[PDB]
């Protein structure tokens, strides 16, 4: 099956970046900062509500309709943007399944890729112009189906250890996160 990510960067820029990379990756090469791979921080974002510069995850949607709704919210100011169609692989996590009822913004319905999404994993893309999907999918000639056809997103059980709730958060005293609790939580 496929995932969908709205993004304002064109396909040529994505290709030259090696794919859809997390913000934290640029931060690391730019100033040594270690990427934040706490799924809760990614979902919560910054105090002010924005995406963290050290984020180690890249967000995707589970439907084309959801990705388009995101594009018409987040990317409303771009007269052109793209929806990237993406195969499933085990660095992907369903945020609401991993954070459970503690997911801070469950309406996001986010499936997030830890460490980003290589170009070979991108099946193709839809161009969106003034908010309209008028064009057929453009296929990525760099896509490699055999890499991904046999792989799935990670199951939530193997995501629990990455939930990364803050140390005093009550989730760490409950199933399932208690089995990954840091000391004292």
């Amino acid at each position: 099956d496929k995932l969908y990510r709205a993004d304002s960067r064109p396909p040529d820029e994505i290709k030259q970046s090696g794919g859809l990379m997390p913000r934290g990756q640029s931060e690391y090469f730019d100033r040594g900062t270690q990427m934040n791979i706490n799924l809760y921080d990614h979902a919560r974002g910054t105090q002010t509500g924005f995406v963290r510069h050290d984020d180690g995850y890249v967000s995707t949607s589970i439907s084309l309709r959801s990705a388009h709704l995101v594009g018409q919210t987040i990317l409303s100011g771009h007269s052109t943007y793209y929806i990237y169609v993406i195969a499933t692989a085990p660095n992907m996590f369903n945020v609401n399944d991993v954070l459970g009822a503690y997911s801070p913004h469950p309406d996001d319905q986010d499936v997030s890729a830890l460490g980003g999404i290589p170009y070979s994993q991108i099946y193709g893309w839809y161009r969106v112009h003034f908010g309209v999907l008028d064009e057929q999918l453009h296929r990525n000639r760099g896509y490699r189906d055999r890499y991904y056809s046999n792989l799935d997103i990670a199951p939530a059980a193997d995501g629990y250890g990455l939930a990364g709730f803050p140390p005093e958060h009550r989730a760490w005293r409950e199933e399932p996160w208690i089995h990954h609790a840091p000391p004292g939580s």
């Binding site: 690391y28 791979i37 660095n91 830890l114 193997d158």
Partner: protein, 162 residues
């Protein structure tokens, strides 16, 4: 002929360096891998599909979700890192005892042989308990990923031995 390769090991072992030394011929500056990298490399008429999966402790539970279809395991060890060789042993044996990995041959890169304190292959073989592995072929290949020494010999072993 094609070979699906899973490259595993602890963080800082040299996996991503190996992948890019093989694919680009060059030594790259890396970032710790938290998801995966994947490239396809052609050598002595074999297409090697090599998966470089992140080795930090928190993301080791994800390793098994890559096991499917794997024909060779490349396990990379930092031979200067005596403090973690035993943890490396425990992670290796956890991999090879998964049912989906039963028929994968195992190449050990005994990496960072350039470093002064470096454990040599005899020592690595013994500290990894490899002679308890009796159901498939394995081999310890000394390497320095940064200089590329040992890598194509490892790849040769994989072809010869599958």
């Amino acid at each position: 002929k094609e070979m699906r390769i899973l490259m595993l090991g602890l963080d800082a072992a040299g996996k991503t360096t190996i992948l890019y030394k093989l694919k680009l011929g060059q030594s790259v500056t890396t970032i710790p891998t938290v998801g995966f990298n994947v490239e396809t490399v052609t050598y002595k008429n074999v297409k090697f599909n090599v998966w470089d999966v992140g080795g930090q402790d928190k993301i080791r539970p994800l390793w098994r979700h890559y096991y499917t279809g794997t024909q060779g395991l490349i396990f990379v060890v930092d031979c200067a890192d005596r403090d973690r060789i035993d943890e490396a042993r425990q992670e290796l044996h956890r991999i090879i005892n998964d049912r989906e990995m039963r028929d994968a041959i195992i190449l050990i890169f005994a990496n960072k042989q350039d470093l002064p304190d470096a454990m040599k292959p005899h020592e690595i073989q013994e500290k990894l308990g490899l002679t308890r592995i009796r159901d498939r072929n394995w081999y310890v290949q000394p390497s320095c990923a940064t200089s590329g020494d040992g890598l194509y010999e490892g790849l040769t072993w994989l072809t010869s031995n599958y």
